[PDB]
Amino acid sequence: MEAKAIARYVRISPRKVRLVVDLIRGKSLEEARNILRYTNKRGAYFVAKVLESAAANAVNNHDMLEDRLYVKAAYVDEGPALKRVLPRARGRADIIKKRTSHITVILGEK
Amino acid sequence: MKRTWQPNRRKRAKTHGFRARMRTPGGRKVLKRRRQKGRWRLTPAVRKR
Amino acid sequence: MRVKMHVKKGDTVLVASGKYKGRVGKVKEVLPKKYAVIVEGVNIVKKAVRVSPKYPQGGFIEKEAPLHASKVRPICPACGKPTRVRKKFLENGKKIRVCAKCGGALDTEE
Amino acid sequence: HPVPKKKTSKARRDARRSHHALTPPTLVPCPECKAMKPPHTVCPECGYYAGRKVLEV
RNA sequence: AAGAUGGUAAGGGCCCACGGUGGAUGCCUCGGCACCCGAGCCGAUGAAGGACGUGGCUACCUGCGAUAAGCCAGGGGGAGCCG
RNA sequence: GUGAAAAGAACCCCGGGAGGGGAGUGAAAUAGAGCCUGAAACCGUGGGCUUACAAGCAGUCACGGCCCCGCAAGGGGUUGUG
RNA sequence: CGACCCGCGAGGCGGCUGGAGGUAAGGGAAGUGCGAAUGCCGGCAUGAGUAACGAUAAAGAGGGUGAGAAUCCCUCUCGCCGUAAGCCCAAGGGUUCCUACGCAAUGGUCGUCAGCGUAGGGUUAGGCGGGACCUAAGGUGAAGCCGAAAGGCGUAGCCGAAGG
């Protein structure tokens, strides 16, 4: 019950999966995978690991039924950045920040 | 456009070093002060072999 | 708990760990106070590689740590120990002049 | 040289972004099989429109 | 037929819960500070301070110098050790 | 700056590995390896009130409509018009 | 986190988290209370998912190894240099040149690839360049003169190289 799966410390950005994880709220799990195979936007590949981890958790360990599961309440949170330098034309140097992300999915029964 | 470093290796040793700091009566103050600054490990021996 | 310390071997009793019992002490260190008056069972894992056997497991790590092991036990276990009165041609006498004496002379019991 | 002024609010930072939401794709099933597919392409598991042309001979 | 006409939220607000990012406050310290006392020079029998080498396998500090994680004598110490 | 002690995660299950769900250690792993307590800015996911003919740094002072805590008396959040 | 006491700064009293220290009617001694100094160190937003990706010598297709490729390897067509974007020596750099593994981070994109990460291996001189041979500008310097001290000039001699 309440199958959980967390992909933690995966580096893209936390605003380039808010565009993707909103497509799989309220859907069923047979149709959240077909909507996510043919979608564009790299960032939709990392979300296609965590549902297929949560499905194996819900089947094997928590002892539910198989094909009655719908994806409830999936979300993504922040992560510790890391800084590098870019040199910028008459001296002055700049700082760019390459951010990470935490994707999590919980999974429930109808 | 020749921005003022332009390295050479005998000029490192014939102005900086040991035989150029232990000759002059004002340059021995440099060694006797860097040996008690807090022990600079050392700078001027950048030269090779 | 220094270069100055006590126990060689001997029927050492314990007081206060949930144990309240006692027998011989086996291998004493110094700078951590590591030995074995073997009571403590633990569960170390054994990594199951062919340099080891196929399925070994834990048990034999004890490490009774402190000075907590109260000392050699005659019929009066309540004892420290003073040093010699030496009563001979210059003994050195590391023996319990306190209550009673089963305290480590060269007999069958060490 | 054309630099801004007062920094924008949360309540109007997050009102431009209201209009960037993206659409799901369009899918129909392959009729020779039983799965999805974008509805004008060759199907990369069941084979064809009328005549194979793909898929592992 | 001329009705206060109203139940919708691409989105925005206020409040209440539950998580992430961040590193302040509390409790500690093998590290410092200021006054007191014991004491107060080493060196061509080659000094203060350094380069390079030395562990069965070794990167870095510490100890030692072709006898190189050491050798020979005297005392202490009384049990486990090969920084 | 983990724990009194490392007993610091054998072995199955998704994964190219990271990483996670179960077992197991422990008085407690929201004490797990940048790991004592762990605040504010900052960014999110669910529930309550409210709005697409209406003009204002903000709020405040009234009256009414829902939601909640109340045995009842009474109170807090929310804001439509003056 | 919260609807008991003082006019106020503030004290109590209850409810969750924490994990081993706190003191108290009456007195004493000062590093004693912060929104502002274009104040100082540390976090995090705004502009914004926009300007940019560093030369107008272009690319295309077929098979491979893999979990995964417009970008890594070979085969076949297409274009630019050709007095230089092609080979050979001195400076300067001083590790990684070559092989077998690998992808967390650096390559302003990807990457099974690399000048990137751990492990092993590799530069052989009587006859090539320089010392055990000379001297130039300059330097150092017995004797000799010197300058309140430090130190300054200087004869023979000696060091001094892409020159003999």
Swiss-Prot record, chain A:
Pfam families: Ribosomal_L22. One of its GO terms (cellular component) is cytosolic large ribosomal subunit. CDD domains: Ribosomal_L22. Keywords: Ribonucleoprotein, Ribosomal protein, RNA-binding, rRNA-binding. GO terms for biological process: translation. It comes from the Bacteria. The keyword Disulfide bond does not apply. InterPro entries: Ribosomal_uL22, Ribosomal_uL22_bac/chlpt-type, Ribosomal_uL22_bac/org-type, Ribosomal_uL22_CS, Ribosomal_uL22_sf. One of its GO terms (molecular function) is structural constituent of ribosome. Belongs to the universal ribosomal protein uL22 family. Part of the 50S ribosomal subunit. This protein binds specifically to 23S rRNA; its binding is stimulated by other ribosomal proteins, e.g. L4, L17, and L20. It is important during the early stages of 50S assembly. It makes multiple contacts with different domains of the 23S rRNA in the assembled 50S subunit and ribosome. The globular domain of the protein is one of the proteins that surrounds the polypeptide exit tunnel on the outside of the subunit, while an extended beta-hairpin is found that penetrates into the center of the 70S ribosome. This extension seems to form part of the wall of the exit tunnel. This is Large ribosomal subunit protein uL22.
Curated annotation (Swiss-Prot), chain B:
One of its GO terms (cellular component) is ribosome. GO terms for molecular function: structural constituent of ribosome. The gene is rpmH. The lineage of its organism: Bacteria, Thermotogati, Deinococcota, Deinococci, Thermales. It comes from Thermus thermophilus (strain ATCC 27634 / DSM 579 / HB8). Residues 29-49 have a biased composition (Basic residues). Residues 26-49 are annotated as: Disordered. This is Large ribosomal subunit protein bL34. Belongs to the bacterial ribosomal protein bL34 family. Found on the solvent side of the large subunit. GO terms for biological process: translation. The open reading frame (ORF) for this protein is entirely within the ORF for the RNase P protein (RnaP). The two start codons are separated by four nucleotides.
UniProtKB/Swiss-Prot annotation, chain C:
It comes from the Bacteria. The keyword RNA-binding applies. Pfam families: KOW, ribosomal_L24. Keywords: Ribonucleoprotein, Ribosomal protein, RNA-binding, rRNA-binding. PROSITE patterns: RIBOSOMAL_L24 (PS01108). One of its GO terms (cellular component) is ribosome. Transmembrane segments: none annotated. The keyword Ribonucleoprotein applies. InterPro entries: KOW, Rib_uL2_dom2, Ribosomal_uL24, Ribosomal_uL24_CS, Ribosomal_uL24_KOW, Translation_prot_SH3-like_sf. SUPFAM superfamilies: Translation proteins SH3-like domain. One of two assembly initiator proteins, it binds directly to the 5'-end of the 23S rRNA, where it nucleates assembly of the 50S subunit. NCBIfam families: rplX_bact (TIGR01079). Belongs to the universal ribosomal protein uL24 family. This is Large ribosomal subunit protein uL24. The lineage of its organism: Bacteria, Thermotogati, Deinococcota, Deinococci, Thermales. The gene is rplX.
From Swiss-Prot, chain D:
InterPro entries: Ribosomal_bL32, Ribosomal_bL32_bact, Ribosomal_zn-bd. GO terms for cellular component: large ribosomal subunit. Pfam families: Ribosomal_L32p. One of its GO terms (biological process) is translation. The keyword Hydrolase does not apply. Residues 1-20 have a biased composition (Basic residues). Residues 1-27 are annotated as: Disordered. One of its GO terms (molecular function) is structural constituent of ribosome. Keywords: Ribonucleoprotein, Ribosomal protein. The keyword Oxidoreductase does not apply. SUPFAM superfamilies: Zn-binding ribosomal proteins (SSF57829). Part of the 50S ribosomal subunit. Found on the solvent side of the large subunit. Belongs to the bacterial ribosomal protein bL32 family. This is Large ribosomal subunit protein bL32. It comes from Thermus thermophilus (strain ATCC 27634 / DSM 579 / HB8).
